[PDB]
């Protein structure tokens, strides 16, 4: 099994534009959205068909109540931050929690918060402590670390509960999450050599250019982009040397398979 991850995001906005929600929660398994909640619908709903098909309505009813509570909690926490920052206008508060089940069987777990899109508090579940980036976060860190039981609870959720949920969701969406669609890879000229791949899943791919069997600071890497049909595409370019002849080859690694395209 490849490496898989489960993460939940929260976004809180203090003075949102008339239509925009003030609170949004979205869960992900790898790059796939699985659940969503916002202050407008006030309902937790599936965002993947294999989630809706495998979780009974009582599951969505229960987490709808929980998220309504977490929504209020987020608003209170954001009100506290912006008052202590002495900030006016609209500001954002974000939370991200989740875990990874690595290929070798090991696990990672993480939990952190952001204010205006910048790191604010980062949890260390081994030392059972919070890393604060400024004195507003330092005040929050002191209050959170005074509740030792909450630190222990989050360590257990990250290391045990989160991994248990991930394995459960992985089986639900096995046909989607554990499949392999190999990339279609080509090369053309535009003066630089462009190596292009498309139609592949999972999105994790490694493309690079090699010059005479040596990999070179001289490569421009494109972003892995969603194609819209569940597959992804990527590219990588390198500039040609007109003063000397060199063997250029594109190297693509994807899902345990290596590919080499020699440029004639």
């Amino acid at each position: 099994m490849r490496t898989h991850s489960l993460r939940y995001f929260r976004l809180g906005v203090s003075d949102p534009i008339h239509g925009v929600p003030e609170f949004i929660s979205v869960g992900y398994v790898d790059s796939h959205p699985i659940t969503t909640y916002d202050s407008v619908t006030r309902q937790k709903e599936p965002r993947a068909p294999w989630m809706a098909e495998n979780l009974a309505p009582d599951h969505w009813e229960r987490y709808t109540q929980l998220l309504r509570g977490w929504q209020q909690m987020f608003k209170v926490e954001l009100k506290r931050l912006q008052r202590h920052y002495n900030h006016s206008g609209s500001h954002t508060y974000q939370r991200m929690i989740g875990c990874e089940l690595l290929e070798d069987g090991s696990t990672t777990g993480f939990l952190q918060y952001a204010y205006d899109g910048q790191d604010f508090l980062i949890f260390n579940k081994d030392t059972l402590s919070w890393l604060a980036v400024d004195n507003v976060a330092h005040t929050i860190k002191q209050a959170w670390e005074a509740n030792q039981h909450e630190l222990l609870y989050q360590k257990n959720w990250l290391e045990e509960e989160c991994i248990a949920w991930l394995k459960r969701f992985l089986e639900y969406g096995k046909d989607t999450l554990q499949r392999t669609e190999p990339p279609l890879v080509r090369v053309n000229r535009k003066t630089a050599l462009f190596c292009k791949a498309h139609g592949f899943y999972p999105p994790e791919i490694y493309m690079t250019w090699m010059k005479n069997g040596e990999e070179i600071q001289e490569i421009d890497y494109g972003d892995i982009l969603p194609s819209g049909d569940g597959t992804y595409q990527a590219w990588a370019s390198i500039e040609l040397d007109p003063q000397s002849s060199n063997l250029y080859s594109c190297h693509v690694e994807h899902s345990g398979v290596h590919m080499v395209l020699q440029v004639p």
Partner: antibody
Amino acid sequence: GQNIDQPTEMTATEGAIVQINCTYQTSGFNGLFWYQQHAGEAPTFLSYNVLDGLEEKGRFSSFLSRSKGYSYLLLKELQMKDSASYLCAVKDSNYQLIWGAGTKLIIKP
Amino acid sequence: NAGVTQTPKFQVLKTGQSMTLQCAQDMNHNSMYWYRQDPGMGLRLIYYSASEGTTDKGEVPNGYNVSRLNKREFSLRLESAAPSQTSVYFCASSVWTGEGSGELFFGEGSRLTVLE
């Protein structure tokens, strides 16, 4: 399904030591609580465990083994005021409390 | 600083009679609960209120209704009392719901006996 079990009643002598057991079979685990309830009164929070080990708190200690699904509440130097029902409760994966039926602790003076 | 205050302490009812239990908390808590306690079994949740402005059913909601009037108050309504609703009712509150280590704070309890 989700189950939690503790003895119905226990009797010990004043000044001695008593260990009240609680075993649980739940879907997920987010912590185990112990509550004290004197006859005709409200339950009051005693302790919380979520990781393995022993946690002391006065004359009372609470132990947890996640792998065995088992916890005990340890009362040392028993006094008559310790006569009460002791309720064990577990938070499941969806943060819902499952309550044991309670153990009535009788103390012989 | 009274904690959780529920009323009444005792009540006898005839089958089919309406009844409302009151509960208030002055601890600025967000979550409130209504339990019933019966001999030989653990506390069973009737209804709960994760936060102000929302409520949902517990394990035994049939025969009951609740109203989260405001942040402090959470009333339990028995519309047509039945003999099986003879029990001791406990209202509780917690700072939040879904926080793992947060304990419950209980009210004194209300003893109801429903008779034919």
